[PDB]
């Protein structure tokens, strides 16, 4: 047999291929990614638990007829919530007048990402706590809520970008620093009987 | 005070717990915990979560749509609506299994994927 049948699967979508044993696996990888509407490089492919490369052949790998290749989504970066909270806690105490624009831009992103980890129903408390942290008054409530609300729903990253272009540095610094302090102390869901249920799970 | 930090502490503790004898009220609360934590992932991460969950559990293709739907509907949930329906509709073993798999895979998966986001935040690690 100069040919081999192989299945590529990601657990949901599976595809039954046939190729020649001396042909690189690239074309199968490309056809599978294409069917998920993805770029080949957004996926990785494993055989017998081992990542394999597009230039390798079923022959080099001692594949057997009807063997299975697993398609796995790439894990790009390691930004767990745990890691984001470490970053926030580190920067919360820092004087930001010092830092490069590149770090400030990234901190803006951190505030936007972390804002989106609060339920909608907490944005009011987040606003009110922001005001009390800064010593601002009800005069500013609408403007602060609108920032948080717009970040919370900022799907394109477009509002975040506008904030970076339109706000002066001192204003950005004041807001970012306010947020990083209050965000770690405020509950991420509102009260309810169901959320009180979580109390029974505390160690 | 269910802070982000406290949410993760609860999840970390319960990922290590044997649920053989789990009480109904505790199971109900674990469902809430999983629903809340699911919503800390960006929508773009749901596919990776589902994929990891299928593989962790040895679930077939036949069950892929179903596990994904649960993830999508927890993620888009409002006022505990879908969560409450899951509690009523699913048998106890199925819920336990789902919750136990979630807690064992969720804590190592990034909560954001965007190239824009990962690139930016890299610079901020101590």
Numbering used by the authors:
A (entry chain B): -77 to 125
B (entry chain A): 0 to 125
Show the paper's wording.
Here, we present the crystal structure of the VP30 CTD from Reston ebolavirus. The two copies of RESTV VP30 in the asymmetric unit are nearly identical in structure and superimpose with an r.m.s.d. of 0.76 Å. One of the Smt domains helps facilitate crystal-packing interactions, whereas the second Smt domain is disordered. The fold of RESTV VP30 CTD is helical and closely resembles that of EBOV VP30, with an r.m.s.d. of 1.15–2.14 Å separating the Cα backbones of the EBOV and RESTV structures. Reston VP30 and Ebola VP30 both form homodimers, but the dimeric interfaces are rotated relative to each other, suggesting subtle inherent differences or flexibility in the dimeric interface. Dimerization in both EBOV and RESTV VP30 is also facilitated by similar hydrophobic interactions between the globular domains and a conserved hydrogen bond between the side chain of Lys180 in helix 2 and the main chain of Cys251 in the linker between helices 6 and 7. The domain rotation lowers the buried surface area on each monomer (RESTV, 1630 Å2; EBOV, 1900 Å2) but maintains a similar surface complementarity (RESTV, SC = 0.69; EBOV, SC = 0.68), suggesting that the RESTV VP30 CTD dimer is a relevant conformation, and conservation of residues within the dimer interface suggests this conformation could also exist for EBOV. Additionally, the Smt domain in the RESTV VP30 CTD structure contributes to the crystal packing as well as making contacts with the opposite chain in the asymmetric unit (buries 545 Å2). The occlusion of Arg179 and Lys180 in the RESTV dimer interface suggests that mutations at these positions could disrupt VP30 dimerization. While we are unable to rule out the influence of the Smt on the conformation of the RESTV dimer, the observation of two dimer conformations in the available structures suggests that there may be inherent differences between the African and Asian viral species.
Essential to the ebolavirus life cycle is the protein VP30, which serves as a transcriptional cofactor. Four proteins are essential for viral transcription: nucleoprotein (NP), VP30, VP35 and the RNA-dependent RNA polymerase (L). VP30 allows the polymerase to read beyond a cis-RNA element in the NP mRNA 5′ untranslated region and to re-initiate transcription at gene junctions. A basic cluster in the C-terminal domain (CTD) contributes to the association of VP30 with NP and is essential for transcription activation.
